[PDB]
């Protein structure tokens, strides 16, 4: 994957968790970031787009940011239902196409 995400975070209910992605000048440094959520055994779904907008029907417990070549996703009031693989996506102006992270697995205890 062109983008670098940390592979896994462990957390407990009711906490905040922030996960991040590192990119470079021609992807995150130039283009807005999307977040994709894949719940265990479900198809992936759009979670967030344009850095900080919620995809339709997504919980307001999700928030996102982009600064320089990095982007972040924060989950507030963590719930068992939030255990999932979260993937970052953006356009890359050097490859002229979509690039992705390898995913961050969030486990909830």
């Amino acid at each position: 994957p062109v983008l670098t995400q940390s592979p896994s975070v462990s957390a407990a209910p009711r906490q905040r968790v922030t996960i991040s992605v590192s990119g470079s000048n021609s992807n995150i440094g130039s283009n807005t970031v999307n977040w994709i959520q894949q719940l265990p055994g479900r198809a992936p779904e759009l979670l967030m787009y344009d850095d900080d907008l919620l995809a339709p029907g997504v919980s307001d417990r999700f928030s996102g940011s982009r600064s320089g070549t990095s982007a972040s996703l924060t989950i507030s009031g963590l719930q068992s239902e939030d255990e999932a693989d979260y993937y970052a996506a953006t356009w890359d102006d050097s490859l002229n196409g979509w690039v992705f992270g390898g995913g961050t697995k969030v486990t909830v205890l």
């Binding site: 992936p44 759009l46 996506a89």
Partner: protein, 61 residues
């Protein structure tokens, strides 16, 4: 068109991740509601960015 309607109209004509029903809807809204042309443009930009994001999701699978 006034200046606001015309600038919103030109941008909306170009948006590649709107379909023609959506595009024509926003252009009718500009015509009907000239004092909210910047609001109409904002709604069209958000929809364009959301449907562009859905393309990244298709690519991902």
């Amino acid at each position: 068109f006034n200046k606001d309607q015309q600038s919103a109209f030109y941008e909306i004509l170009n948006m590649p991740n709107l379909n023609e029903a959506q595009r024509n809807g926003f252009i009718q809204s500009l015509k009907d509601d000239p004092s909210q042309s910047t609001n109409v443009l904002g709604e069209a930009k958000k929809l364009n960015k959301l449907q562009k994001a859905f393309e990244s999701l298709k690519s991902f699978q």
